[PDB]
C-alpha cells in the first residue's frame, strides 16, 4: 500500500505503457510493466511466461536478456534500484 516514485528510466517505460501519474503503488508499477511488455510483444510467442527484453530499454533496467514471469526476482531487484519509497 506504500506509495513509491519511480526513477526517470523506469518512469519512461511506465509512460510508454500509458501511465500519467508520478506516484504509484508497487502493484500499479507492476501493472504498467506488464502493459508495456504486452504492447511491445516482448513475451515469447510460444512459451508466454518467458519475456525477451534484450535490445529494449526494459532490458537495460532489468540487466538481463530474458526472464520468466514465474522467476520474477530480476524485476523486483530492478524495482529496488528504481523506486523511491515515499
Amino acid at each position: 500500500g506504500t506509495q513509491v516514485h519511480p526513477r526517470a528510466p523506469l518512469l519512461q517505460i511506465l509512460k510508454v505503457a500509458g501511465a500519467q501519474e508520478e506516484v504509484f503503488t508497487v502493484k500499479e508499477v507492476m501493472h504498467y510493466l506488464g502493459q508495456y511488455i504486452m504492447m511491445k510483444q516482448l513475451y515469447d510467442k510460444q512459451r508466454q511466461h518467458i519475456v525477451h527484453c534484450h535490445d529494449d530499454p526494459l532490458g537495460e533496467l532489468l540487466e538481463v536478456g530474458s526472464f520468466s514471469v514465474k522467476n520474477p526476482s530480476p524485476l523486483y531487484e530492478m524495482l529496488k534500484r528504481n523506486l523511491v519509497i515515499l
Binding site: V26, K27, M30, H31, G34, I37, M38, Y43, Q48, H49, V51, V69, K70, P72
Partner: peptide, 14 residues
Amino acid sequence: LTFXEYWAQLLSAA
C-alpha cells in the same frame, strides 16, 4: 497460458 494471464497471476502477488 497467455502472457496477460501469467502477468495477472504475478501482479496479484504484489
